[PDB]
Design a binder for this molecule. Sequence first.
Ligand code: FES
Ligand SMILES: [Mg+2]
Lengths: 135, 49, 225, 86, 100, 26
Amino acid sequence: AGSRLETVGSIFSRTRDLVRAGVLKEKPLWFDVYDAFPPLREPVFQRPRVRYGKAKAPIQDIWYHEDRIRAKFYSVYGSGQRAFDLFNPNFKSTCQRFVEKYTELQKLGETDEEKLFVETGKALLAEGVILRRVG
Amino acid sequence: PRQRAIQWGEDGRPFHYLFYTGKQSYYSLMHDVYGMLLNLEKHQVIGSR
Amino acid sequence: EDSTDFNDKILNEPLKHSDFFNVKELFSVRSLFDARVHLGHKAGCRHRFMEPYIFGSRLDHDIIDLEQTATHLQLALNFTAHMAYRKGIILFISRNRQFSYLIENMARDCGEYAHTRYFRGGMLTNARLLFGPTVRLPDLIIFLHTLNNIFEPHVAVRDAAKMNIPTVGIVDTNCNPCLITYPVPGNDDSPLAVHLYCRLFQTAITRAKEKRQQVEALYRLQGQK
Amino acid sequence: GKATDRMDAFRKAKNRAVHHLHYIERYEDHTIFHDISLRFKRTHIKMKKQPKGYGLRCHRAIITICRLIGIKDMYAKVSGSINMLS
Amino acid sequence: NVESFASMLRHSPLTQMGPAKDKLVIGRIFHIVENDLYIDFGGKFHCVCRRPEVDGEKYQKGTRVRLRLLDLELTSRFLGATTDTTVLEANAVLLGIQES
Amino acid sequence: SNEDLPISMENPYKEPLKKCILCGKH
Ligand code: FES
Ligand SMILES: [Mg+2]
């Protein structure tokens, strides 16, 4: 039968070689399928090593420009008493509605930060939104 | 003694879908009892041992 | 005389098409996103061999790159369909007890096999002694969860490689995919994700079996006349 | 192979080895493709590619294994620990 | 004009929520064990809350509740471990029932 | 390239470091 050295190559290379060497009389049922549509990576055993010294993982933190507006909104107005509905894929919270208005006004030419944040709050209050400052 | 019949056919395919557990009869019973306990939730001594 | 024509029109024909069973129509990046397939574990649980498949970390929560999930899932579903078409034995494995009942029903419905219970030592590497000298082992093993209940790789991953059985596997951000033949990075915890996987594999396997009967039936009708 | 009786150990060893087979690439089906120098634990092995007619000039255990693999021409030197299993 | 994954992630409610601590979310009871309520709120993991003492009979499978999230996944690394230990469940406080 | 890609920056939600009750006092 096939070699059980699972840490020496992959099931494909071990099978292919033993078929060449006449050890395996017939190819397994999956061999022709693997050969026609191989995986992106050949499944070879590898030993996981801990990182030492200055080695770091290449995973980056996911940030967006609007995160600065959210961080300020939550610090000024806190989490909206309205509850998030994460089941609705199109849900918009009070903060997101604040971020959109903030973005619109910024595209109208306004560049100041402290001024662009106070005008946004007024616009929402005019629309009937409840904005209770935390302090 | 009562002997268990063949567990696969000429093509080698086992008959029962829980064959590879080695305890198909036991786990087939646990699966059926567990399934009944679920359906009840969706819907909602002296002389025996 | 007639065997070469059989194997050429039935077994070798589907291997000449990039997507013979049209499995790309079963899912999309949006459908995977709605099923929360992109949600991974916290960064403190990340496995090193999963870094290539991670889009990033959103507030210490790893996000799985669904663009790679779609390409890996395409290859995995395509391989599963070809094996079902060739009448291979497909065994689903998973120790996640929240989904044991779901997975056993899915296997019984598609006409395949499930092992969601405690995995005893040597089910694969000592099968001739446990089942019999003529027992036929699975041609493909699909892990819907690659970890056991102490957060270690399921023993069957190693033993499937020992017995040279290809493996398809959903690999979360804390899993080890080195020995998985066709890994699919994705969320393995949320019921929406697990339910999606079961539908895709079940549909891919059921289509491939119906395709095998359509091709055979047509090959016989034309054979007589 | 391990057993109380020697013939039982022989049976276990050879029946198990045939399920743990490597495939060894051979250059022109008589030697290795390039010089090989490695250490396994404390055993050092240095192998040299050789032309035809050179023969097997190696540790007697390496000669035995080379005949089973199909290598006809090679030089090898073993240094450090001469542990047979290593 | 096929939306990319980067666009989906940017505009998803879970991404727009920011930090999860002290965030009010709506959950759904999908499983009950005695007085343990298993609640899904749109995250990777569910949370387990105990049946409140008042109006306990109103909490059934399918009931939609209000939660105050504390953490999306309870994890922690302990002395000598090479990776974090995770209990595979979120941390949240059951506030009450949501009604229209 | 693409406007929806993440951008590199410092954690905007980072909480200020905690201070002891005597921080800044003689
Ligand atoms: S925190 Fe103690 S002196 Fe600043
Ligand atoms: Mg997981």
